[PDB]
Amino acid sequence: DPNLFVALYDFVASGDNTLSITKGEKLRVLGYNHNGEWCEAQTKNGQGWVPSNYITPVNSLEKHSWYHGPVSRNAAEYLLSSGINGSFLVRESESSPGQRSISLRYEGRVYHYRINTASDGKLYVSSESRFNTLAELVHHHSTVADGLITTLHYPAPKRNKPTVYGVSPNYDKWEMERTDITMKHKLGGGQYGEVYEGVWKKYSLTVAVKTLKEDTMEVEEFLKEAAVMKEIKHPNLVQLLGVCTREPPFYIITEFMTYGNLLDYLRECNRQEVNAVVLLYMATQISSAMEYLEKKNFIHRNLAARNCLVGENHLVKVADFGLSRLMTGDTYTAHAGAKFPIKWTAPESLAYNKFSIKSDVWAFGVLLWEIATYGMSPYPGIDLSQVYELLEKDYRMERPEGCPEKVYELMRACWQWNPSDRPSFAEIHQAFETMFQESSISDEVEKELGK
Numbered sequence: 001d002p003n004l005f006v007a008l009y010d011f012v013a014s015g016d017n018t019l020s021i022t023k024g025e026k027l028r029v030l031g032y033n034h035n036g037e038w039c040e041a042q043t044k045n046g047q048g049w050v051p052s053n054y055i056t057p058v059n060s061l062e063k064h065s066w067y068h069g070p071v072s073r074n075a076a077e078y079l080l081s082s083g084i085n086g087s088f089l090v091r092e093s094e095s096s097p098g099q100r101s102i103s104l105r106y107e108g109r110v111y112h113y114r115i116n117t118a119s120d121g122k123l124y125v126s127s128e129s130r131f132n133t134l135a136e137l138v139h140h141h142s143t144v145a146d147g148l149i150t151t152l153h154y155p156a157p158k159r160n161k162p163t164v165y166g167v168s169p170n171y172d173k174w175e176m177e178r179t180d181i182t183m184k185h186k187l188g189g190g191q192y193g194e195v196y197e198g199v200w201k202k203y204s205l206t207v208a209v210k211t212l213k214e215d216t217m218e219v220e221e222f223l224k225e226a227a228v229m230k231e232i233k234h235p236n237l238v239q240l241l242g243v244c245t246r247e248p249p250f251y252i253i254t255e256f257m258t259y260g261n262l263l264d265y266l267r268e269c270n271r272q273e274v275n276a277v278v279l280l281y282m283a284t285q286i287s288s289a290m291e292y293l294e295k296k297n298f299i300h301r302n303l304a305a306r307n308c309l310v311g312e313n314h315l316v317k318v319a320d321f322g323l324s325r326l327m328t329g330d331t332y333t334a335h336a337g338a339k340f341p342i343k344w345t346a347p348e349s350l351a352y353n354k355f356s357i358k359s360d361v362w363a364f365g366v367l368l369w370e371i372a373t374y375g376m377s378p379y380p381g382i383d384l385s386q387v388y389e390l391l392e393k394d395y396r397m398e399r400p401e402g403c404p405e406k407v408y409e410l411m412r413a414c415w416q417w418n419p420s421d422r423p424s425f426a427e428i429h430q431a432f433e434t435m436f437q438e439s440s441i442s443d444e445v446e447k448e449l450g451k
């Protein structure tokens with residue numbers, strides 16, 4: 001059937017022009033909104049707007065539960081860490097489209113197999129067994145291993161619904177009615193200011209709300225934050241859902257991250273569940289968010305684990321309050337007297353109050369060390385008076401217990417004295433993705449410890 005789609009995720013209607021759909025249901029798509037992120041569809045139940053990536057053409061690989069599309073080798077190992085023998089998925093290379101691999105779990109290890117393509121287009125893992133389509137290849141290996149360590153029996157679940165950047169398919173419908181928001185308890189014991197957990201009645205949706213109470217944050221500052229957040233769109237940066245700027249108290253409403261900040265999460269987690277592959281997954285997400293800020297000409301200035309928030313299934317998002325606009329390559333100078341979190345501050349910032357995307361790279365290195373140590377305080381017992389002097393003499397924190405060598409080298413690259421000698425976030429993200437190609441991070445941690 002021409003133009004037929006199938007729902008990949010459930011979606012509940014609440015914005016009156018939106019439509020409720022159930023995973024597996026068929027839909028006909030009528031058209032798209034202004035940015036293609038939402039589409040008007042018809043089902044046997046009705047007609048209305050639904051998120052475009054919650055559905056897929058009946059004729060596309062994404063309809064298969066085992067096809068996870070653009071997922072990296074490391075992300076695949078995370079997805080399969082919750083599985084059993086025979087759990088598997090098929091993924092595609094993000095950089096080089098068309099290149100696919102099978103990731104399969106067996107006896108606690110994940111095996112990765114490249115899917116080869118013959119001159120006539122047939123696909124195979126083992127040359128003796130070639131197929132016309134991907135689905136036929138998977139079906140074959142679902143019954144006999146035929147070259148694989150075991151059979152493909154349990155597709156890795158797609159546990160996370162795609163991010164929706166807002167709540168409406170329409171153009172700028174950010175303003176919302178304050179009466180539809182129920183404010184609850186403050187979040188973070190006040191470390192983030194006037195931020196409260198709240199419920200957005202209209203959707204019984206839990207949210208985070210920052211309110212401009214009198215004699216707190218300056219108005220221009222609050223509004224600039226709201227303005228900046230309207231432009232930020234990335235899976236790993238806290239997403240804006242709406243604002244209330246018609247009258248005081250002004251509100252900034254965002255998605256709610258259920259587990260709190262990364263620092264507390266790492267300090268209180270079960271290290272068996274949150275193993276090295278999970279830490280790598282979280283660090284990679286943070287680098288992706290920073291690569292986005294880098295390309296969009298923003299600087300953060302407060303990158304640290306306490307400013308990264310954790311959601312379900314180890315999703316991590318960087319808090320995006322306080323961002324500043326700065327053409328990537330230029331320098332921002334803070335007015336003398338500014339007080340900074342010394343342990344996460346680059347040398348040029350400490351000495352000259354100069355900040356750039358490169359000082360964020362330095363902070364990312366400290367954040368990486370916090371991740372690798374499950375939240376230890378940086379520089380143990382070093383006085384917060386001799387840090388600059390020590391750094392100037394090339395002292396740097398020591399490699400964390402069990403930390404793989406390549407991860408520590410990345411930390412050291414981030415801590416180069418001269419900002420121009422530090423890698424870009426694009427380079428950092430790419431480095432994580434290509435870091436454990438001939439053995440797992442699990443294996444490397446072993447070599448580090450056994451030693």
Ligand SMILES: Cn1c(=O)c(-c2c(Cl)cccc2Cl)cc2cnc(Nc3cccc(CO)c3)nc21
Pocket residue numbers: 187188192195196208209210225238252253254255256257258259260261309318319320321
């Ligand atoms: C602390 N905090 C914020 O400052 C913002 C936010 C806002 Cl409301 C406006 C602009 C920018 C940001 Cl980052 C969003 C936000 C979302 N989720 C959370 N979750 C959270 C934080 C601390 C503890 C707990 C546990 O109850 C859960 N905390 C959040």
